[PDB]
Structure formats: structure tokens, C-alpha cells
Design a protein around this ligand. Structure first.
Ligand SMILES: Cn1cc(-c2ccnc3[nH]ccc23)c(-c2ccc(F)cn2)n1
Length: 285
């Protein structure tokens, strides 16, 4: 009676949209676990689902990479089924009345840097770094930060040679303007530096509750750009956070980030503030 995709996954209601297409809840009846289901019309002009499924598979087994359960076709749609994950950092931030404590911001930072370094180690750049695209795990994996939504992800080097993409200009802002790097706002081809810089804005977003460039009425994107460029990093939180954003801006187009330095930057603060390494988040307490 009930709809089951490939007779395997009881269909649930809609959760959201991703870089492309709609996402749905489902239940894996045989495995007994909840799942997420993405559909793309096979009739679509520029198919995007196959590239993302190809990227997930190469990363499969990496810490915080969702596991693919099925990728088939049903009706007019292509389908990919992943294990269901928990709430996004955006949903946890709103759930906490838009207030995260420094300890939690720092605990998130350690994994978020680690997730981007992993992505980069596999020759892709994410290009859509925002709180919505980090999800906590379910159950015993609820302490693990996951990265999702590789639909705007791009290869930044070649697997064999490790030779970087070319400098390019006049490229529309891919991803979300609020967390976009200044280079991204300028139309510069995005590279590895831009994923970590966007994260730097994510950390200040968690600290501030909003960003200095968020309230504003092609022009809206222009307004966001001008406010960020016109806003000094120093324009009330521990200095380690400001050192991070300035470092990312100084990176060259092709430069490999010093990921270990950045993690150790926040951990030294984590230690000096004397927070416990118990991995208890604001929503745990
Ligand atoms: C934006 N977005 C959020 C999710 C999502 C939500 C909850 N749990 C999840 N577990 C794995 C992904 C995911 C997805 C998604 C879902 C399935 C898929 F094949 C591709 N992307 N997109």
C-alpha cells in the first residue's frame, strides 16, 4: 500500500531543497534506519545528480561523508538515497535562539576545518560553505560533523598531476552571498582559499547572530559585497578568530592552506579558555 522507493524506502514528507532538486525523508524498512532521498527529473536540461553521486562515492568512507544507500531511477526521476543525518548547524543555531557559546563554536571549528581539508585532499573544492551544509550525525554518530551538498563542488586539480585550475574571471557568484569570499564577490574563479574564508564568516556568524552585511534591501548581491569589503576584520571576540580570516584572504589562488596551523589556532584558545574536551554542545546541555 504505502509508497516505497524500489520497494525499499518508505516515502516520507519533504525536508528541503539542496543545490538542485528536492529532498525527502524515507525509512529504510529492511535496514531499519531513516534515510534522505534526492530526486532530479531525468528530463532535466543539465543533469546534476550523477556528478554529485560520483563525488560522494569517491569520498565514501571518509569521516563525516554520508554513505550512499541506493541510486536508482523511479518514474520520471533519478534518485539517490543516503543515510538520514541530524540537524544542520543552521537548525541548531536557531534552536539555540541564535546563540552558540565559544566552546561549541571552537569544537565545531575543529571538525569543519577537517572536513574541508578532506574534501580538498580528494581534489574538489566545495564552493558553498554555509551553516546549512553541515549536519550532525544521528544516534551514536551525533558527535560527528558531516558535510553535504556537493552540487556546486568543483575539481580544483587533476587526480594524477595535481595541477590547479586556471585563473578565470567574470563568473557569477556561486553559492550563498552572505558567506561568500571577497574574491568570489569579485567574480574570480573560486579556489581552495575561498572555502576556508567562507567558513571564517560562518564562525563569526555563530558568534554574532548575524553578519554586518546581512541586513540590506543584482543590487542586493552588490550591496552585500560592498559592505564586506568596506568592513575591517577588526570591525570584540577572541583574536584567534580575526587572525583566521586575515590569513585566508592572503592565500594565493593556487596556494595549499596550512590546515594544521588553523586547527591548532582555535585549540590553543580552546585550552586557554579551559573548556573541557568532552564534546558537549549547547544543544546537549
Ligand atoms: C541539502 N541536503 C540535505 C540533505 C540531507 C538531509 C538529511 N540527511 C541527509 N543525509 C545525507 C544527506 C542529507 C541532502 C541530501 C539528501 C540526500 C541526497 F542524496 C543528497 N543530498 N541535501
Amino acid at each position: 500500500m504505502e509508497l516505497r522507493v524500489g520497494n525499499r524506502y518508505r516515502l516520507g514528507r519533504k525536508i528541503g531543497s539542496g543545490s538542485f532538486g528536492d529532498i525527502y525523508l524515507g525509512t529504510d524498512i529492511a535496514a531499519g534506519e531513516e534515510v534522505a532521498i534526492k530526486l532530479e527529473c531525468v528530463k532535466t536540461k543539465h543533469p546534476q545528480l550523477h556528478i554529485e553521486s560520483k563525488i560522494y562515492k569517491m569520498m565514501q568512507g571518509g569521516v563525516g561523508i554520508p554513505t550512499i544507500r541506493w541510486c536508482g531511477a523511479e518514474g520520471d526521476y533519478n534518485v539517490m538515497v543516503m543515510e538520514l543525518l541530524g540537524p544542520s548547524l543552521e537548525d541548531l543555531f536557531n534552536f539555540c535562539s541564535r546563540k552558540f557559546s565559544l566552546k561549541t563554536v571552537l569544537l565545531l571549528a575543529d571538525q569543519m576545518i577537517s572536513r574541508i581539508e578532506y574534501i580538498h585532499s580528494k581534489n574538489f573544492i566545495h564552493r558553498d560553505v554555509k551553516p546549512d551544509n553541515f549536519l550532525m550525525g544521528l544516534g551514536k554518530k551525533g558527535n560527528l560533523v558531516y558535510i553535504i551538498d556537493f552540487g556546486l563542488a568543483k575539481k580544483y586539480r587533476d587526480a594524477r598531476t595535481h595541477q590547479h585550475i586556471p585563473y578565470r574571471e567574470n563568473k557569477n557568484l556561486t553559492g550563498t552571498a552572505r558567506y561568500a569570499s571577497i574574491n568570489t564577490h569579485l567574480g574570480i574563479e573560486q579556489s581552495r582559499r575561498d572555502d576556508l574564508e567562507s567558513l571564517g564568516y560562518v564562525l563569526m556568524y555563530f558568534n554574532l547572530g548575524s553578519l554586518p552585511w546581512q541586513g540590506l534591501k543584482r543590487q542586493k548581491y552588490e550591496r552585500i559585497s560592498e559592505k564586506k569589503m568596506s568592513t575591517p576584520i577588526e570591525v570584540g571576540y577572541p583574536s584567534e578568530f580575526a587572525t583566521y580570516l586575515n590569513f585566508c584572504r592572503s592565500l594565493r589562488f593556487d596556494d595549499k592552506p596550512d590546515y594544521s596551523y588553523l586547527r591548532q589556532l582555535f585549540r590553543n584558545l580552546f585550552h586557554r579558555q579551559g573548556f573541557s574536551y568532552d564534546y558537549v554542545f549547547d544543544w546537549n546541555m
